[PDB]
Amino acid sequence: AILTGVPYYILPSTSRAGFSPDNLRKNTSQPSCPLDLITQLRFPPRIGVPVIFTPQNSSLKVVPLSHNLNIHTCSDLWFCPESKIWTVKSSSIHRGLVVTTGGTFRSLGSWFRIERHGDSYKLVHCPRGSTPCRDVGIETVGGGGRRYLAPRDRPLAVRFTRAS
Amino acid sequence: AILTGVPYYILPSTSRAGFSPDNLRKNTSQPSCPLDLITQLRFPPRIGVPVIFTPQNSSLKVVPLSHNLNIHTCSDLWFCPESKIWTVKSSSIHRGLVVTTGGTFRSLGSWFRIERHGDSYKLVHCPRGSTPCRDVGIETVGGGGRRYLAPRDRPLAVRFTRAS
Ligand SMILES: *[C@@H]1O[C@H](CO)[C@@H](O[C@@H]2O[C@H](CO)[C@@H](O[C@@H]3O[C@H](CO)[C@@H](O)[C@H](O)[C@@H]3O)[C@H](O)[C@H]2NC(C)=O)[C@H](O[C@@H]2O[C@@H](C)[C@@H](O)[C@@H](O)[C@@H]2O)[C@H]1NC(C)=O
Ligand SMILES: *[C@@H]1O[C@H](CO)[C@@H](O)[C@H](O)[C@H]1NC(C)=O
Ligand SMILES: [Cl-]
Ligand SMILES: [Cl-]
């Protein structure tokens, strides 16, 4: 029921507090975005900015579970020079790997999968498009009060809302 | 001088018809942009969309001539999932190499230089950030009635107008 190329909001399974790339939150053009995190919109809870899933297998109209895909933010506004494509980067101040935008389609570090998590789903990131994959969850360390997505093997249960 | 991190319009030395990434001319969301050309705004001539130059030593305040740099489009609107960073791609439809957006900062394929050319300048693209470089000029083949930038060793003389 997740469709290739269609925008969805990623939301926590039990919450209305969705997610946005940092650059879209800050409303300001910058000359580079070395660590454009995906952060939760909490005060008040806001739906965030949708993403699109692109399976590694290009013929697929339905996004399969447990299979390599790219994610990218769907937004006509963009305040970074880098891409809208999600990837993972290491950050010393955030105490390890974090999800960011600025990736490259079909690159070795670009691969995520959607998996079942109880009655919901979870996102995982798969280095080099292979297992072992790390669960994507919410972290706070180094986030200056914000909650950001990171592949640290603690899953955040998510639901998808079609953005149409 | 040409200043780092300051937006400039690239213009032909003797014309007001500047340049824009194709996705900005279309002004609608795209699922992907495999070949986002930089095309000339001719009829009527319009100044285009500015760019920012980032020298390979990104700490320099003046952009050096004859020295590797990245170029990216300066725009808050962006209709592609891929980056605003310039690169070169092969296109059989366009009978060879073409300038496009969707590059990656500091990547092998990302390097251009600004060189003096007569009393004006030219852009060159430098495979792997090394010489020899190929002069960037204007082409029409496969362009559907538009002119696009391509590194085919016939230089377009250009000037740079600071955007404000
Ligand atoms: C070229 O493309 C851009 C980006 O799509 C257009 O700007 C966008 O126009 C929308 C209207 O078609 C604006 O949507 C409104 O947003 C608010 C708040 O989210 C809603 O409450 C409201 O009901 C609309 O949905 C959108 O904000 C705007 N985006 C940006 C970043 O500016 C642009 O349209 C032109 O400018 C804007 C400001 C509008 O006034 C349009 O009517 C106008 O055509 C497109 N340009 C052209 C020439 O078509
Ligand atoms: C960005 O714009 C939104 C919507 O106008 C606003 O509510 C928010 O506080 C702004 N963020 C910053 C950092 O200015
Ligand atoms: Cl990972
Ligand atoms: Cl070249």
Residue numbers in the entry:
A (entry chain B), B (entry chain A): 1 to 164
What do the study's own words say?
The fold of CrataBL consists of a β-trefoil, typical for this protein family. A number of its biological properties have been characterized, including delay in clot formation by impairing the intrinsic pathway of coagulation cascade. In addition, CrataBL was shown to exhibit anti-inflammatory, analgesic, insecticidal, and anti-tumor activities.
The three-dimensional structure of CrataBL was determined in two crystal forms. Both of them were in space group C2 and contained two molecules in the asymmetric unit, but the unit cell parameters and crystal packing were different. Further analysis of glycosylation by mass spectrometry and protein sequence determination has shown the presence of N-linked oligosaccharides at Asn27 and Asn57. However, it is not clear whether the dimer observed in both crystal forms of CrataBL is biologically significant. Since we were not able to obtain crystals of CrataBL with a target protease such as trypsin, the location of the reactive loop may only be predicted. However, the observation that CrataBL is slowly cleaved by trypsin between serines 58 and 59, located on a loop that is involved in direct interaction with the active site residues in trypsin and other serine proteases, lends credence to this assumption. Thus the detailed structural basis of the inhibition mode by CrataBL still needs to be verified.
